[PDB]
Amino acid sequence: SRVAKAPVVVPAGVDVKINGQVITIKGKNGELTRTLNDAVEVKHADNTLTFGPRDGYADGWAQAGTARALLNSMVIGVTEGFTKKLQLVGVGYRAAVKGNVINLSLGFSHPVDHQLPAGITAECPTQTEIVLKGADKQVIGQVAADLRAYRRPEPYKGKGVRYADEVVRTKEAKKK
Amino acid sequence: MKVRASVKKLCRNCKIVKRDGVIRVICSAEPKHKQRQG
Amino acid sequence: MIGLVGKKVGMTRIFTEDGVSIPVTVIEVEANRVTQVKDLANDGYRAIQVTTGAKKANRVTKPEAGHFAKAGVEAGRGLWEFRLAEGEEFTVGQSISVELFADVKKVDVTGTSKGKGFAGTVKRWNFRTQDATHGNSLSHRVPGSIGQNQTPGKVFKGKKMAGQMGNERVTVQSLDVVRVDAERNLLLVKGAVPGATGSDLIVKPAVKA
Amino acid sequence: MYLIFM
Amino acid sequence: MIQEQTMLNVADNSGARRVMCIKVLGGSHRRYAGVGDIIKITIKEAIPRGKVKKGDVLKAVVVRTKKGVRRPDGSVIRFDGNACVLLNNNSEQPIGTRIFGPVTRELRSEKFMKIISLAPEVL
RNA sequence: UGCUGAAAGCAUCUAAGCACGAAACUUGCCCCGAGAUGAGUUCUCCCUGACCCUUUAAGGGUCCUGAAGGAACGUUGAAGA
RNA sequence: CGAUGUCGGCUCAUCACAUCCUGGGGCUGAAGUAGGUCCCAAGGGUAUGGCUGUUCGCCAUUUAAAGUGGUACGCGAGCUGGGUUUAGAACGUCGUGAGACAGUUCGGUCCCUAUCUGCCGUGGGCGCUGGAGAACUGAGGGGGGCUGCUCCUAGUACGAGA
RNA sequence: GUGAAGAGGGAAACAACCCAGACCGCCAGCUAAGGUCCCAAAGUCAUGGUUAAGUGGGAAACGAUGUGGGAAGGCCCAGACAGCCAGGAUGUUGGCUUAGAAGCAGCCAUCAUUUAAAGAAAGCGUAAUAGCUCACUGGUCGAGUCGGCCUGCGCGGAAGA
Numbered sequence A: 001s002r003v004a005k006a007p008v009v010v011p012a013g014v015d016v017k018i019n020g021q022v023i024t025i026k027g028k029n030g031e032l033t034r035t036l037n038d039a040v041e042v043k044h045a046d047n048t049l050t051f052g053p054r055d056g057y058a059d060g061w062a063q064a065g066t067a068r069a070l071l072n073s074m075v076i077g078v079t080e081g082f083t084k085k086l087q088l089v090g091v092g093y094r095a096a097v098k099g100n101v102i103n104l105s106l107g108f109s110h111p112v113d114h115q116l117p118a119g120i121t122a123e124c125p126t127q128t129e130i131v132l133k134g135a136d137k138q139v140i141g142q143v144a145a146d147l148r149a150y151r152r153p154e155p156y157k158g159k160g161v162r163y164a165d166e167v168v169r170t171k172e173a174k175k176k
Numbered sequence B: 001m002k003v004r005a006s007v008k009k010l011c012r013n014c015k016i017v018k019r020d021g022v023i024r025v026i027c028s029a030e031p032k033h034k035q036r037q038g
Numbered sequence C: 001m002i003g004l005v006g007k008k009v010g011m012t013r014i015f016t017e018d019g020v021s022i023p024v025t026v027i028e029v030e031a032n033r034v035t036q037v038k039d040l041a042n043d044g045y046r047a048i049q050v051t052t053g054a055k056k057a058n059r060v061t062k063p064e065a066g067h068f069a070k071a072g073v074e075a076g077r078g079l080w081e082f083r084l085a086e087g088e089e090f091t092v093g094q095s096i097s098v099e100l101f102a103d104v105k106k107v108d109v110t111g112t113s114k115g116k117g118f119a120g121t122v123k124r125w126n127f128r129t130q131d132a133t134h135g136n137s138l139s140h141r142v143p144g145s146i147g148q149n150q151t152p153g154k155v156f157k158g159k160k161m162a163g164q165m166g167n168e169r170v171t172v173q174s175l176d177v178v179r180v181d182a183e184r185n186l187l188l189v190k191g192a193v194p195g196a197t198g199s200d201l202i203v204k205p206a207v208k209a
Numbered sequence D: 001m002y003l004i005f006m
Numbered sequence E: 001m002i003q004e005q006t007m008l009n010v011a012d013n014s015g016a017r018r019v020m021c022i023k024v025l026g027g028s029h030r031r032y033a034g035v036g037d038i039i040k041i042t043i044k045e046a047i048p049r050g051k052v053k054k055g056d057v058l059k060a061v062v063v064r065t066k067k068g069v070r071r072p073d074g075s076v077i078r079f080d081g082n083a084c085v086l087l088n089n090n091s092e093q094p095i096g097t098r099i100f101g102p103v104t105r106e107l108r109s110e111k112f113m114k115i116i117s118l119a120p121e122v123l
Numbered sequence F: 001u002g003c004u005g006a007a008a009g010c011a012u013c014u015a016a017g018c019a020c021g022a023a024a025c026u027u028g029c030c031c032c033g034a035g036a037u038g039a040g041u042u043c044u045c046c047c048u049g050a051c052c053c054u055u056u057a058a059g060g061g062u063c064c065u066g067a068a069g070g071a072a073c074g075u076u077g078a079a080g081a
Numbered sequence G: 001c002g003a004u005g006u007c008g009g010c011u012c013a014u015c016a017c018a019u020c021c022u023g024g025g026g027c028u029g030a031a032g033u034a035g036g037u038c039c040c041a042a043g044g045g046u047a048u049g050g051c052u053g054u055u056c057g058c059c060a061u062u063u064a065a066a067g068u069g070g071u072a073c074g075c076g077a078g079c080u081g082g083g084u085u086u087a088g089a090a091c092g093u094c095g096u097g098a099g100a101c102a103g104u105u106c107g108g109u110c111c112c113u114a115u116c117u118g119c120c121g122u123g124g125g126c127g128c129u130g131g132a133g134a135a136c137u138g139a140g141g142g143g144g145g146c147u148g149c150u151c152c153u154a155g156u157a158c159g160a161g162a
Numbered sequence H: 001g002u003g004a005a006g007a008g009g010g011a012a013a014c015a016a017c018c019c020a021g022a023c024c025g026c027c028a029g030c031u032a033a034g035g036u037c038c039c040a041a042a043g044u045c046a047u048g049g050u051u052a053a054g055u056g057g058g059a060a061a062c063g064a065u066g067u068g069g070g071a072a073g074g075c076c077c078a079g080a081c082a083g084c085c086a087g088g089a090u091g092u093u094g095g096c097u098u099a100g101a102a103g104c105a106g107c108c109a110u111c112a113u114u115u116a117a118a119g120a121a122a123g124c125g126u127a128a129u130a131g132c133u134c135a136c137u138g139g140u141c142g143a144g145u146c147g148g149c150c151u152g153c154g155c156g157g158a159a160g161a
């Protein structure tokens, strides 16, 4: 309710089209769609959205604050987008982008490949870093968790795929 | 992960969360403080 | 892929120049003339129907001889079906040769087993005999116990007991095609296939990897 | 010999 | 087809004259041991001043069988008696220095490269 | 194990939404299987005469007719008490 | 109590999960290898001998492991008859004695042609709506599912070294 | 009290529990215990709440921001709780012990200052320190917030042939 009552200010040049419960937002970076819950009420106004608990539904305030924050981040994704930075720690660990596929070599016996879904474009400035550009927040967050799931950071040397904004806890090995 | 009948907060970083009908304890600082009720 | 119908001729041996013995089974795969083609809009499923060999014209009945005369093929000794895959099409009357297996590396051969008749539980289910000596009273190759006491008080379904062994359809999978001999209608698979000499075999390509 | 239950 | 309680002759100069198989190694419920298969033995007879004593429990390798081996062209090579070569319990290297009688090509590998080097004849 | 995310301005794998996850489950492999009385489907083959009566109706009878096929008998079988 | 055959062995099994192996995970006082502990999981698999009537146990040698229980401590109208239990005889002991033992020892008749249910096979009758000969579909049901070792990746990752 | 020596209706089936004592006949009506969606006779009745577990339709100590109600309490527009940006100190190695102990191995005290406020510092860590960090006080933000009691219904604890 503290989240659900602060309105979403729609910036200049993004088409917000409301059709019942299905919302569409076009913009400079792309077009996004999110089918809203039945328990929330959205209304178009002066370049600014509003979310209210629809009557006949018990948990409408909780569904409003979620529907607010998801549409608050839709208007960021169609304007400035999102980003995630994943750096690789460990000797002989490398990455490579060839199209919409990432070629990771993480000390296996085979080479691994990740096929990026439509909407994400990765690039590697260094061979020990990945930068992910995306218009959706969840999809750029799930793809960053799939590359992290190949080789999670170990608590002894920190080896493996890690986020650039994540501190890794390390600990000494057992004394003999 | 401790599976016991009485789960608690063992420090000031533990958080009690009900996930899928199970009372769990999540700790941000100590992974030893992970508990579920069962 | 579709298969063919053949006939177990018997076993022999193929000698290779590096000195290996390969036990092969000879299957005479005569041409398989297509009798009827089934489709989704009329039969609910896609399949062809083939016949092989030849039958005595005084032995074909009037219902059967009309089914062959609709296709134009000549009356063989039987009728088998094969399920089509997505992308195969055949025409009525077309004869299929043994060259279907030219580059096929492995096949599945299914036939009717030999008949062992009424076989006891030692032969049929590989049970253990009891003592031949040491006091045994008329109980050497009998099954023994067939249940438990008052609970349940019945013998369970699927209990292993004496009965008819053999004379049933079994499929032997993944046999190496050793040599295809198209000019005399032969197919040499590697190993033992089910059935006695002169029985019908159905040779389909291997479904497993 | 164990002839009757006893 | 060597199994348990089978008494074998010995085909090296370690001193043992007859050994008895007490275990077929290399599997659960395993029944037989052909040529080239390790067995666990016990010594039943021995010459007085050999390297091994009667009663010892050792490992061996079967080099000849009366049942015989089969070659990939269908041939068979049989013998008139079962024989073996005593190996060490842990290093599994042959204790003796000479091999007597012929052996077969089933021992031709890196494990038994020292037995077919001392053999008088390999079939 | 997570991603996004409020109720609870933060945090949160969950309440809305989304993604992974085992020899267990449903399939895929092999066999029986329309008595599946819910008794299914397709293909082919065969029969194209006359008369009378009562209780007039899925009625009964007479003469002619006997088809496709089946059974029976014999010679038998890698089939079988 | 007008009888519901006892311990053990053989044969044949079937279920539970409080899981022995294999499978998937969390924590580790988890560097690696190897472990400890807990959670999920019942598909399959889950020893041969010496001694003893033994179940049990100890021992020898294996194995990936040699699970724990229920089923009339599963199973004698399926087999055995070794045992703590008929009648013979002896020892030790108790009793004056006949005899007795909770102790040991040698010998000692295990019946039944299956009516009903159940199960394994195999047919006859009728139905399925004119009769007949074939080929199918597949509702449903059953079978099967174990695992070792060696080599490559690589003496790489890890480790002061081993 | 009932069965024995007692039928009928209910409790699934169920001598001893609940209702109730069969003289006989009826194709009449009213009720008891128990019930009224279908098996199966009668309310998919009316009004007001609770539950989200198929709880109802097995089980305890104990555990938990599940959820409904009630009476009080603390802080709050002189700005409350959360989030954020900051500061968060020097005397002081307070003294004792220790090769080190400098708040944080152990003992004793635990003030002074400048200020808006800061501890002889609650904890982590370390050879010891450092280091992070909390108590406290500013600015931002602009409306409620915090945790005890009594209580109704729920969740886990909860494994077998």
Ligand SMILES: CC[C@H]1OC(=O)[C@H](C)[C@@H](O[C@H]2C[C@@](C)(OC)[C@@H](O)[C@H](C)O2)[C@H](C)[C@@H](O[C@@H]2O[C@H](C)C[C@H](N(C)C)[C@H]2O)[C@](C)(O)C[C@@H](C)C(=O)[C@H](C)[C@@H](O)[C@]1(C)O
Residues within 6 Å of the ligand: D002, D003, D004, G003, G005, G110, G111
């Ligand atoms: C030749 C055929 C004879 O059977 C046998 O020899 C078998 C082998 C006996 O077991 C033998 C052997 C043995 C060990 O029992 C198997 C022993 O205990 C008895 C005393 O004698 C049987 C079965 C005995 O039964 C058993 O009698 C026990 C006293 C009680 C038991 N109970 C479970 C009902 C009961 O089944 C018993 C007494 O003979 C049955 C009675 C009717 C007889 O006397 C009948 C006439 C027998 O002579 C007979 C049928 O002609």
Ligand SMILES: [Mg+2]
Residues within 6 Å of the ligand: C137
């Ligand atoms: Mg007898």
Ligand SMILES: [Mg+2]
Residues within 6 Å of the ligand: C136, C137, C138, C139, C140
């Ligand atoms: Mg006999």
Ligand SMILES: [Mg+2]
Residues within 6 Å of the ligand: none
């Ligand atoms: Mg019953």
Ligand SMILES: [Mg+2]
Residues within 6 Å of the ligand: none
């Ligand atoms: Mg009686």
Ligand SMILES: [Mg+2]
Residues within 6 Å of the ligand: none
């Ligand atoms: Mg018993």
Ligand SMILES: [Mg+2]
Residues within 6 Å of the ligand: none
């Ligand atoms: Mg019995």
Ligand SMILES: [Mg+2]
Residues within 6 Å of the ligand: none
């Ligand atoms: Mg006597």
Ligand SMILES: [Mg+2]
Residues within 6 Å of the ligand: none
């Ligand atoms: Mg006595």
Ligand SMILES: [Mg+2]
Residues within 6 Å of the ligand: C137
């Ligand atoms: Mg008997």
Ligand SMILES: [Mg+2]
Residues within 6 Å of the ligand: none
């Ligand atoms: Mg199945």
Ligand SMILES: [Mg+2]
Residues within 6 Å of the ligand: H006
């Ligand atoms: Mg009564």
Ligand SMILES: [Mg+2]
Residues within 6 Å of the ligand: none
């Ligand atoms: Mg009743």
Ligand SMILES: [Mg+2]
Residues within 6 Å of the ligand: H041
């Ligand atoms: Mg009714």
Ligand SMILES: [Mg+2]
Residues within 6 Å of the ligand: H057
């Ligand atoms: Mg219940």
